[PDB]
Each structure stands twice: as structure tokens, then as C-alpha cells.
Amino acid sequence: NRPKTYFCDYDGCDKAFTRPSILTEHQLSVHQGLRAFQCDKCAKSFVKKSHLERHLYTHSDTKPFQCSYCGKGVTTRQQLKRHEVTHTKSFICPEEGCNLRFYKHPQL
Amino acid sequence: MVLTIYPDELVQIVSDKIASNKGKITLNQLWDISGKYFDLSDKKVKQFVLSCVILKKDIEVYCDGAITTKNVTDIIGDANHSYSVGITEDSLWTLLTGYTKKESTIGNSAFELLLEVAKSGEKGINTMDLAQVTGQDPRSVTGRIKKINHLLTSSQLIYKGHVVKQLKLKKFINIRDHLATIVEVVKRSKNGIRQIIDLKRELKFDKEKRLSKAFIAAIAWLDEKEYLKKVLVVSPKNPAIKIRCVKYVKDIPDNFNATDLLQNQGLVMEEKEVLLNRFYPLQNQTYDIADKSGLKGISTMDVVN
Amino acid sequence: MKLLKDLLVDRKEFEDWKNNLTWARDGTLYLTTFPDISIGQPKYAKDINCNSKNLFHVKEFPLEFENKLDFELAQQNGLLNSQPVCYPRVCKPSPIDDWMAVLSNNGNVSVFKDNKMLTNLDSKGNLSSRTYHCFEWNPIESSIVVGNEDGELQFFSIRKNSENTPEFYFESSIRLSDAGSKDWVTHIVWYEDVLVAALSNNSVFSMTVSASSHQPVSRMIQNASRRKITDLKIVDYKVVLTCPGYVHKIDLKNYSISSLKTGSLENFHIIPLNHEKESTILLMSNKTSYKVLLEDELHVTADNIIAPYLEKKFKKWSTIWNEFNNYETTLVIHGISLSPDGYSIAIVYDMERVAFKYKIASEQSFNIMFAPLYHTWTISERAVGLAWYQTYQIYNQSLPKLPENFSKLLNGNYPISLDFQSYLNALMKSEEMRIIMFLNMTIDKPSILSFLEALYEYAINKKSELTNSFDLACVLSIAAILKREAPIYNGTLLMKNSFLEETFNLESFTADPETVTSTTNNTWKRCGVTLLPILTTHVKICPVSKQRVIDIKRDDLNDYGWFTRGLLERFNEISVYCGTTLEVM
Numbered sequence A: 001n002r003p004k005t006y007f008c009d010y011d012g013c014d015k016a017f018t019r020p021s022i023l024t025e026h027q028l029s030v031h032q033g034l035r036a037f038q039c040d041k042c043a044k045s046f047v048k049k050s051h052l053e054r055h056l057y058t059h060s061d062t063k064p065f066q067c068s069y070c071g072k073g074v075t076t077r078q079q080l081k082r083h084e085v086t087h088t089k090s091f092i093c094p095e096e097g098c099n100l101r102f103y104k105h106p107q108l
Numbered sequence B: 001m002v003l004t005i006y007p008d009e010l011v012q013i014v015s016d017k018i019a020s021n022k023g024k025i026t027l028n029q030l031w032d033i034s035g036k037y038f039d040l041s042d043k044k045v046k047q048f049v050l051s052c053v054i055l056k057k058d059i060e061v062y063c064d065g066a067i068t069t070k071n072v073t074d075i076i077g078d079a080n081h082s083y084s085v086g087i088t089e090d091s092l093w094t095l096l097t098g099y100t101k102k103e104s105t106i107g108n109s110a111f112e113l114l115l116e117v118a119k120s121g122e123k124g125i126n127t128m129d130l131a132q133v134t135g136q137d138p139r140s141v142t143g144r145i146k147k148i149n150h151l152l153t154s155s156q157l158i159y160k161g162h163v164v165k166q167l168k169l170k171k172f173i174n175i176r177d178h179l180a181t182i183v184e185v186v187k188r189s190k191n192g193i194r195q196i197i198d199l200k201r202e203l204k205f206d207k208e209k210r211l212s213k214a215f216i217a218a219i220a221w222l223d224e225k226e227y228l229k230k231v232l233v234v235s236p237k238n239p240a241i242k243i244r245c246v247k248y249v250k251d252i253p254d255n256f257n258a259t260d261l262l263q264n265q266g267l268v269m270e271e272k273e274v275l276l277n278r279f280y281p282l283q284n285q286t287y288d289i290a291d292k293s294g295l296k297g298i299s300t301m302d303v304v305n
Numbered sequence C: 001m002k003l004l005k006d007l008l009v010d011r012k013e014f015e016d017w018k019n020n021l022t023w024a025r026d027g028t029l030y031l032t033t034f035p036d037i038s039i040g041q042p043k044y045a046k047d048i049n050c051n052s053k054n055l056f057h058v059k060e061f062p063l064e065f066e067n068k069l070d071f072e073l074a075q076q077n078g079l080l081n082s083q084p085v086c087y088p089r090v091c092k093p094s095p096i097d098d099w100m101a102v103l104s105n106n107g108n109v110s111v112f113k114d115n116k117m118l119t120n121l122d123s124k125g126n127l128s129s130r131t132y133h134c135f136e137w138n139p140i141e142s143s144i145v146v147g148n149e150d151g152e153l154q155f156f157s158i159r160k161n162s163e164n165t166p167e168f169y170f171e172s173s174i175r176l177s178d179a180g181s182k183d184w185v186t187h188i189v190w191y192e193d194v195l196v197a198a199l200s201n202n203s204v205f206s207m208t209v210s211a212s213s214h215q216p217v218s219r220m221i222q223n224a225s226r227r228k229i230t231d232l233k234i235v236d237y238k239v240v241l242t243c244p245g246y247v248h249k250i251d252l253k254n255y256s257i258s259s260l261k262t263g264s265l266e267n268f269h270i271i272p273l274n275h276e277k278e279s280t281i282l283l284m285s286n287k288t289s290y291k292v293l294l295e296d297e298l299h300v301t302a303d304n305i306i307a308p309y310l311e312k313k314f315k316k317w318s319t320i321w322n323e324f325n326n327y328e329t330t331l332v333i334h335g336i337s338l339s340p341d342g343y344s345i346a347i348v349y350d351m352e353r354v355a356f357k358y359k360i361a362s363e364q365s366f367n368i369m370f371a372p373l374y375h376t377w378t379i380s381e382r383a384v385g386l387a388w389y390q391t392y393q394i395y396n397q398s399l400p401k402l403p404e405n406f407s408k409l410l411n412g413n414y415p416i417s418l419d420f421q422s423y424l425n426a427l428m429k430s431e432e433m434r435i436i437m438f439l440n441m442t443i444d445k446p447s448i449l450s451f452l453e454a455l456y457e458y459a460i461n462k463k464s465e466l467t468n469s470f471d472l473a474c475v476l477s478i479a480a481i482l483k484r485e486a487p488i489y490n491g492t493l494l495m496k497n498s499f500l501e502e503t504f505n506l507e508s509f510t511a512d513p514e515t516v517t518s519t520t521n522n523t524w525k526r527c528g529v530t531l532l533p534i535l536t537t538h539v540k541i542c543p544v545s546k547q548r549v550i551d552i553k554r555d556d557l558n559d560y561g562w563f564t565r566g567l568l569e570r571f572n573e574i575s576v577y578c579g580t581t582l583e584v585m
């Protein structure tokens, strides 16, 4: 919506941003080499609250997305969708007019 | 053993206790608070102590939600209705914020957030339990908390897998290191130029006027000591729209962000070193310059200057 | 040493560029801001943290004026009742007593105690004789001189102050002007025994003024002249005055005259460095300042005392508000004043561009700079309370010059037994009492043992009159803390408050200065002067030692005796520990 009208000034940086706090998040993270959210359970650190929140689940068994078929736990919707698509007849015969459909790619 | 205090010191302590517990306390809580410092084993002491509290104009007495104005001995003996004691709203405002409701900059919603931190005291409240207890979302809580971040001590903590900060009322940056960073940041800027307002914004010296003053002084010192040069850049289409920038020089051994304008050709760099006619009325003078400036017109900042 | 950070007065205005700052005996600053006075009320704090705001708190002082020249039509002064809505034009505190006098815009002088008016000065005569233009306080005794539009220096003097509100009454008037002349008084200065006064036509008169003489010799030291007297001061009996382009020095020991060109027409303020070995003055103006040594000959020398700081501040400001040197700029001084002890100076000023300024009240602001005038300093008998602390802080906490035999500590010899209320006066007039009061501002735990010995000696002598129970209780308390024998008496004391009464064995008052236990097994703390139990919700608090004092004007149940009544009536406002005014609730 609103136009990108805050330009990073550093040598060899191309980026422009919508609102000045975001330009500052970029500058402190990329160019100065500082981060604002530390893991309690390992050495790593993160640039956003949502990124530390994802990393915190990785230290735990009670992972926040749970499979509808097998009940395996995962941390975000992309992982869930890819995993659940393995519980489907995903693959299709690529050859002309052939009707068949398959569950594991080596079968196809 | 009863702790020794002067007769009027309890008025301070009861005010602090009342301001902590959201503006009102029960008579039993008042007696519990008093029992630490006076021997309430006898009604004679109770009558004396309750008078000290009722005598301060800032303090109010209530009964089943209504106001009460009987004699102090009547409040001790007339133990029939539900009774509570509190402080006038303007006084509660003043005791917590330092300003009266009539002039204070804190909004009602934000003041209620402050009252929750006041109730929690030494324990304080994490931003999510605060959010749940007040009954509003984290965006709203965060946008409101800005108005009171000067009154509250805070730090990061992890709670229910979410990342949150603790808040406590206070009662429960060295610029000399950063000069090297200011020179290196300008040194790393495109063509060795950076807007001073944008440089303040990068290092986050914009959060407090205290930090702003420190930054402006540092830039001036680096200019005087010849590590940097203050320079203007002028909009090729507008001589009044000029950008205050720092230029890199050597290594250490008007407020609009113009990073938009610096994207143009903008080559009008300038390294740093009144028409008023008495006889014709001011009307005709603004008219004459507005005419002489032609079809492109003139800005109010050009006319006044 | 570095100077304290300036006190930033905001949203206040001044109506004219005259000297507007005065500094009272108790350390209170007075600024004649328009339309209401701004008082730099003094406060105590040990963590000053280099900031003057921790010493002075600024608040509006809305006095109320009533005008005796109202109803009366203006004559040869057309401006007299021109603006009928009064406002303060001049404001001076007492140098020895403790009052304030103010010249209203319509030319009345009115005298005040805090925010309460005492009296409006008036005397019989024509409309011009009743209208005042300058006033000054006697540096030795309770009296005031006022210069009127008839050219008469009129005297008023003060009585009734011990019994009731001080009566100011008319005494006499020297007509300093020539017979039938229309010139009027503009300045008066009064140092030790010599009074010096200047009329509008620049004629100046020096005379010895004393209670012992009815006939002061009005010797005119400077003839009527063209050049206006901008400022006038007495400096080690030398009179000093300044005019556009000139400084004139006169010696009153022989009435001889001398002059030096100032080299500029900007107004010069005369700052007399009274404590220096050689009579010396700093001259101050909005563009330059220098030191004139007043020996037999005059001299020009560097203002190394004050100028370097102002130049630094002015360069600092210029670096932000005139970075291109685009504008001519000036240091506008709205007032300058010496501390009551004379060891420090306060300058009220702002930096401004010469331009088409259209200011408004909300944008106006001023910096007050406090600075030390010497390398060494001492207590003074004029200044009291927080005034000592102010100098101590301004000198970067450097301690004052203590006596070599006394460096409690000294407890000087007291061979006295004067009448009781006056005995407490003589006691507080002593040098040893003053240094004790200052020491309490520096040590970790305040004390008054030296003072208690004076009351012990009085009670021990007056044994035949210690008949009252409370009076005996006070004496017993003093004896026990002092480790000197307690006078023989027996029985129980009774003390009361508005709801509760407690009986105490006189022996229950142990040697402990902190607490006492009642016969009902209830504990209570002791008062900071009479040592009695603090049972009432009406004590005043000491801002230095945090001790409590019982307000004798508020108590209406305790049957106090002559010793207790006399102690409290003498310490109902002034702190026994530090001379500061006690806070009230």
C-alpha cells in the first residue's frame, strides 16, 4: 500500500522501506551486526520477536502444530502442509493421457 | 514489637498503600496497616489513628458505596454497613503520575494499566498477564505503554512460549564510547555523506531529548576537531529545501527525513564557512514577491525568510 | 572548579531591562518578573548532582496590591495612575530583619512577610510627596528610607514586633532637592553609617545617617549634570557610579572626585567585591566585562572571575543558534546580585539575535548562573539558614575557614544568665552557634549538644521557678542526655492530643534522645527542641535534620509552663539545628 520512501544509505546496499523503524531494524541487523532477542536454551539470537518465538518451540516436545493424520508435531503451517501432503496420493503420471496417481515418488 | 513512627508519618504510608491497592482499602486493611506501627489492641489508639487519616483533606470515607462524614468515634462504633477508605482521584493521579488529571498527558486506558502495575508492586506484571487482566490485546497494550515507559523499570523474559517484558514502578547512554561508531558509520555511507536527522534515527538517539542533545554535541565536536564536515545539499528545484548532512574527512586515532531527496541527481553540495521596506504596507510586499516569483509561485518559508 | 548547571526559569517575562534579581537573607531568590514575582524558594538535598535546581524551586508569588494614591488625581507626574491595575516594579528583602518591600507600578511602597501584607507606607504631604520612586533598608537597625517625588528622603522606623505585627511609622524627612525644584529621588544606597542618594538631575548627596544624630550633613558630591546615573554603589566608603561612556569614583573620607572612560555606552552594572584586600569592582555589560581596581588611582584588568564562563556558554549557544555567524547576537543580562554573604554572584540572562522578534510569554525563558567570587570563604552574621549551604555548594563543596583553635567541636564559653527570651536571642547571636548550624549541613548525623548546655545551665540556675510539670520534664530530658545531674522532683506527667491522653512517670524519660514509653505500655518519639513526647498531628518538620517541632500556635490542650512556652515561642518557625524555616502541614 504505502510507498517505500526510506532508503538505506550504506555502500553497496539497495533496500528501501515503508516506515523508518523498519529501516533501522535493517540497519542494526545487517550493517552493524547486532540482534535483539536471545535463546534461553542455546547460543543463537534473532532479529524479531516472532523469530525467537519459533526458535523457542524447537527446544520442546509440545510443538504448536499437530498432524491431522499421523499426529506428528511441527512448528509452522508450511511444515504441516508439506508433511500432510505426504499423507496424500500427491504424484501424477506425466505421460500423455495416462490416468494413474501415486503416493511415493519412486512408485511413479 | 510495635514499630515507632511520628503521628503524621502514617498518612504517608497509608497514602502509598492506598495508591498501590487501586485507590481504596477496607477499614480492616487500614487496621492491619496501622497494627505494624500502633497498638490497636485498644479502641483509644484506633480513634487517635483513624483521626490522623481522616484529617488529611486528600482522604475520603465510604459506606456501602455512599460517602460518610460522621465523627471519628462514630466510625469506630457504628460497625454496621460495609466500609472503605480511599483518596480523591486528582490526588491518586498526582501520587502516581506527578501531575493532576486536569493536565496530565497519560490517557485513561494507559492510567488503568499503570494502576495494575501499582497493585502488583514488587512482583510487577508481565505484559501478557497485564493484557489479560486489563482485558485488551497486545497491540493496544504496547501502543498505550509508550505513554508510561518513563515511570516503569522493564526487562525481557519468556512466558508461555511468548516473548514479554516485566514492568515495575521505579520505587519497588555514554556518548564518549560512540564517537568512533559515528565516524565509521559516516565513512561507510554512500559517497561519504549522511543526513544528520537520519544518523540520529539509525543509532536510535531519537528516543529521548537527553540522547538528542548528546548526539548534536558529538556531531559538532567531530566537525570542530575536523574528523567530519557539516555540509548543506540544496534541492535543485527549491533553494529553501536544504539538507543538513555530515561529510567524512579522517579517522579517529528542517527536520524531515530527506533520504528521498538524496536519491535524485541532487549535486548542489555546499561546505559551510532581509528585504523589509518600511514605507509600503506589508500586504503589498508579500504581493510583490508573490508576483515577481512568477508562474512557479513562492512558498511561505521563502516569503517569511 | 566547574560552576553548577544553570537554573532554567521558563514561561516568565520581564517588563523592563533594569536589575530585576534580589537574594534574601535566608537564601530565597526574588525575580521581579511580570505580572507576578517568581521566588526561587530554597530547599535541602545532599545529592545536588551538579544541578542548581536541587537548591532552588521556582514558583509564582501572587501578592495582592491595594493603592493609596487611588481616588487621588495625577498631577505633574502624568503617568502616576495611568495604568490603574497594579503590578510589582521593584522588590528588596531585609538585610538584617526578615521582610520584603515592594514598589508598586503606581509608586506606593508596601512591606510584606511571606505572601501576607504587613503595611502600606504613607505620610502627610502633597500628592508628589506621597509617591515613591526608590527605597532602601538600614544595614544595622529596623528602619527604612524612602525617596519621594518632592525630593525628600523620608524615614520610617519599626516597633511593636515582639507583641504583634511590626508597626512601620513615619519619623522625619530630609528635603534633598533645592527649594521649589521638580527633580526627584532615583537611587539610595546605605552601607554601615553612610547613606548616599541620587536625584533625577544626576545630583548626588552623601551623608552620615545614625540614631545618635538629628542633623545629617547633605554634602552634594556631584553637581547637577547631563549624563544619567545607570548604577550606584558604596565600596569601602568609596562611592562608585556609572554613566554612558564613564565610571566615576568618589572618596567620602575627603569628598574628592575622579573618573575613567568605560569605552562603551552599554549599561554597566557595578559588582563590588567587598571581601577583597584592596577595594575592587567588576563592571558588567551585555557585550563586555572587566575588573576595575579602586586604589587611589583607577585601573583596567581582566574579569577572570566571571567572564570565561559566560564566553564559553555564549560560544556554545552560538554553535547552535548562529552557526554561520549570520546574525549579530547579544548577552542580555536581566539582573545581577551578590549572595547575602557576598561570596557568590547570580546572573539572570538570555542569548538573543538582533532581529524582527515578536516574542510571546510561553516562548520566553531565562538561565540563572551561580558563580564563586573568591578562592576562600567564611560564614557571615547577615546570611542565615540555607544561605550558608548555597555558598558551600557553589564553592564545589569546599569547606569554609574554621577557627585554628576549633579545627560538636568548639562549644565556646558562655558566662551569661540574661532574661530568658533574650537569653535565647543572645545564644543564637553567638559565633559558636552559627558554625554549629553550618556543620549540621555537612555531617552524617546532626546534633545540638552545645545548645542544650545553655538551657541546662539556665534551668539549673532558675531552680526556684521550675514549678510546672512539662517544664520539669523538659529539664530532666536535657540533664539525662547531657550526663550532668538531674534536679530532684517526683510524680507523674500528663500529656494530651485532640482524642488521647497519656500519663508518664518523670523517671520514664530515660537518657535516650530517641524514644519514651508511656504508663499504658505505648512507645512514642521525642520532640527536637523541648524533648517532650510527640503526641500531635500538628508538628512542623525540619528540612535538614528531619526532626519534629510542636506548633505552640496549634496546641490547645497541653498546660505548658514558662520554660516550655518560651522555648516553643522562640523556635516555632526557625530550626534549632540549622536556622532554616520548618515545613508546615
Ligand SMILES: [Zn+2]
Residues within 6 Å of the ligand: A008, A009, A010, A013, A014, A015, A026, A027, A030, A031
Ligand atoms: Zn542496507
Ligand SMILES: [Zn+2]
Residues within 6 Å of the ligand: A039, A040, A041, A042, A043, A044, A055, A059
Ligand atoms: Zn536455542
Ligand SMILES: [Zn+2]
Residues within 6 Å of the ligand: A066, A067, A068, A069, A070, A071, A072, A083, A084
Ligand atoms: Zn502427521
Ligand SMILES: [Zn+2]
Residues within 6 Å of the ligand: A093, A094, A095, A098, A099, A100
Ligand atoms: Zn502412465
